[PDB]
Write an enzyme that holds these catalytic residues in place. Structure first.
Site, mmCIF file in Angstrom:
data_model
loop_
_atom_site.group_PDB
_atom_site.id
_atom_site.type_symbol
_atom_site.label_atom_id
_atom_site.label_comp_id
_atom_site.label_asym_id
_atom_site.label_seq_id
_atom_site.Cartn_x
_atom_site.Cartn_y
_atom_site.Cartn_z
ATOM 1 N N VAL A 41 0.805 -1.211 0.000
ATOM 2 C CA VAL A 41 0.000 0.000 0.000
ATOM 3 C C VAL A 41 0.849 1.278 0.000
ATOM 4 O O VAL A 41 0.379 2.328 -0.426
ATOM 5 C CB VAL A 41 -0.946 -0.001 1.208
ATOM 6 C CG1 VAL A 41 -0.138 0.007 2.526
ATOM 7 C CG2 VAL A 41 -1.904 1.174 1.151
ATOM 8 N N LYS A 42 2.097 1.180 0.460
ATOM 9 C CA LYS A 42 2.955 2.379 0.680
ATOM 10 C C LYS A 42 3.417 3.024 -0.603
ATOM 11 O O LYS A 42 3.939 4.122 -0.555
ATOM 12 C CB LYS A 42 4.176 1.999 1.502
ATOM 13 C CG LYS A 42 3.851 1.609 2.952
ATOM 14 C CD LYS A 42 3.144 2.749 3.706
ATOM 15 C CE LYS A 42 3.419 2.582 5.224
ATOM 16 N NZ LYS A 42 3.011 1.219 5.589
ATOM 17 N N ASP A 43 3.269 2.358 -1.748
ATOM 18 C CA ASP A 43 3.631 2.986 -3.030
ATOM 19 C C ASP A 43 2.887 4.307 -3.253
ATOM 20 O O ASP A 43 3.406 5.210 -3.908
ATOM 21 C CB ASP A 43 3.321 2.062 -4.218
ATOM 22 C CG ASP A 43 4.333 0.929 -4.390
ATOM 23 O OD1 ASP A 43 5.235 0.765 -3.537
ATOM 24 O OD2 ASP A 43 4.211 0.188 -5.402
ATOM 25 N N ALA A 46 4.388 7.063 -1.047
ATOM 26 C CA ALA A 46 5.753 7.271 -1.509
ATOM 27 C C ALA A 46 5.775 8.153 -2.743
ATOM 28 O O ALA A 46 6.587 9.082 -2.837
ATOM 29 C CB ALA A 46 6.430 5.936 -1.793
#
Length: 339
Positions: A41-43, A46
Site C-alpha cells: 500500500v505504501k507505493d 511514496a
C-alpha cells in the site's frame, strides 16, 4: 500506455472475500494493494511525498530522500526515487525481516539499521531519521528531504485523491462501510475523507491490534496500550498528523488469534497469503458487517503479502510460544527415484 513503473501504482482491483461475505450476509471486498509494483500500500504515499517535494523545489536531480521506515515505505520510496533520478537514505530497525532489508539494498537504498526503540526514546528510527535528514541537508547540494510518512499529510492526501476515488468508482457508489488498521493513519483518515465527501452516510471503522493505543483513545479518551501483536506495519501509540481531526464511526480491537484464523484459512480456501495487517483488516470488516447487518457492501485493504513475515506470522514454534493458532498444513511420500 505506461511510460514507467510509476504508472502502475494504484488502480488496484477489489477482490471479493468469499468466506467473510458468506458468514455475514454482506459483499465484503479487499483492495489488492499488494499488486502495486513495490508490493504494498505504501507505493501511494511514496509517490505523493516525492512529487510534493519536487513541486516545492526541495528536490533537485540527484537529491536524497531520507526516511525512517520499517520497510514498505522504504521500498516504495526507493523505487520511485530511482525512476525519477533521486537517491534514498533509509533508517530501518534491525529487527525487520531479512527479505525486506534485501529488497531495499537490491533497489539501491543506502540502508542504516538501528535497534528497535519505543517512540519515547529519541533513538527511535522515526525520530532518528528526522535528525539524519537535518544532518544530510547541510551537505547535499541537490537537497535532502525528510519523507516523514507518519506526520507528512501528503500521505493522507494520496488516499483522498486515489484510494477513495477508486473504491467509490469500483463499487459503483454502493459502498456502505470502509475499515482499515492504522500505521501512519494515511490510508484510514484519507480514504475516509474522500469517501465521506462522496457520501456522508458511509461508515468508517478502525481495526486496531493489541498493543496499539488508538481504540482506547477513540472509545475512552485514553491513549492506553495493552498487550502486543505479532502483526507488522500497524499499531500506533499517538495521534499522528495524518490522524489529526479523524474520528471513526466504529472501532474494533482485534486479538491476534482472530486475525490469524482468518489469514490461515485464506491461504487454504482462497489462495491468498497476506500479511498480518490484512488479517486485522478482514477481521474488522467482519465486525463492521455484523454491526451494519446483512445486505451491505464493505471494503477493506489487503496491504502486502504474507511472504515477508514467514519466520513469525507462519512459524509454528514462534506461534506456539505465544499460544497462537498454527497453520494446520505446516504440521512422507516415497520418492520414485530410479537406480
Amino acid at each position: 500506455m505506461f511510460n514507467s513503473v510509476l504508472d502502475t501504482i494504484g488502480n488496484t482491483p477489489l477482490i471479493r472475500l468469499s468466506k467473510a461475505s458468506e458468514l455475514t450476509g454482506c459483499d465484503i471486498y479487499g483492495k489488492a494493494e499488494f499488486l502495486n509494483p513495490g508490493q504494498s500500500v505504501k507505493d501511494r504515499a511514496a509517490l505523493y511525498i516525492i512529487r510534493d517535494a519536487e513541486k516545492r523545489g526541495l528536490l533537485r536531480p540527484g537529491g536524497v530522500i531520507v526516511e525512517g521506515t520499517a520497510g514498505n515505505t522504504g521500498i516504495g520510496l526507493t523505487m520511485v526515487a530511482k525512476a525519477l533520478g533521486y537517491r534514498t537514505a533509509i533508517v530501518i530497525p534491525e529487527t525487520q525481516s531479512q527479505e525486506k532489508k534485501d529488497a531495499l539494498r537490491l533497489l539501491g537504498a543506502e540502508l542504516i539499521e538501528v535497534p528497535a526503540a519505543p517512540y519515547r526514546n529519541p533513538n527511535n528510527y522515526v525520530r532518528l531519521s528526522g535528525r539524519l535528514a537535518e544532518q544530510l541537508a547541510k551537505t547535499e547540494p541537490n537537497g535532502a528531504i525528510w519523507a516523514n510518512q507518519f506526520d507528512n499529510t501528503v500521505n493522507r492526501q494520496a488516499h483522498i485523491e486515489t484510494t477513495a476515488q477508486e473504491i467509490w468508482r469500483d463499487t459503483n457508489d454502493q459502498i456502505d462501510g470502509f475499515v482499515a488498521a492504522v500505521g501512519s493513519g494515511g490510508t484510514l483518515a484519507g480514504t475516509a475523507i474522500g469517501l465521506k465527501e462522496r457520501n456522508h452516510n458511509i461508515k468508517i471503522a478502525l481495526a486496531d491490534p493489541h498493543g496499539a493505543a488508538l481504540h482506547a483513545f477513540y472509545t475512552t479518551g485514553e491513549l492506553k496500550a495493552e498487550g502486543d501483536s505479532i502483526t507488522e506495519g500497524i499499531g500506533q501509540g499517538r495521534i499522528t498528523a495524518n490522524l489529526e481531526g479523524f474520528t471513526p464511526d466504529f472501532s474494533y480491537q482485534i486479538p491476534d488469534a482472530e486475525a490469524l484464523d482468518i489469514l490461515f484459512a485464506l491461504v487454504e480456501e482462497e489462495g491468498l497469503c497476506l500479511g498480518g495487517s490484512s488479517g486485522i483488516n478482514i477481521a474488522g470488516a467482519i465486525r463492521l458487517a455484523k454491526d451494519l447487518g446483512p445486505g451491505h457492501t464493505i471494503v477493506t485493504v489487503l496491504c502486502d503479502y504474507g511472504n515477508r513475515y514467514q519466520s513469525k506470522l507462519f512459524n509454528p514454534a514462534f506461534l506456539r510460544g505465544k499460544s497462537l493458532p498454527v497453520p494446520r498444513w505446516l504440521e512422507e511420500i516415497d520418492i520414485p527415484f530410479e537406480g
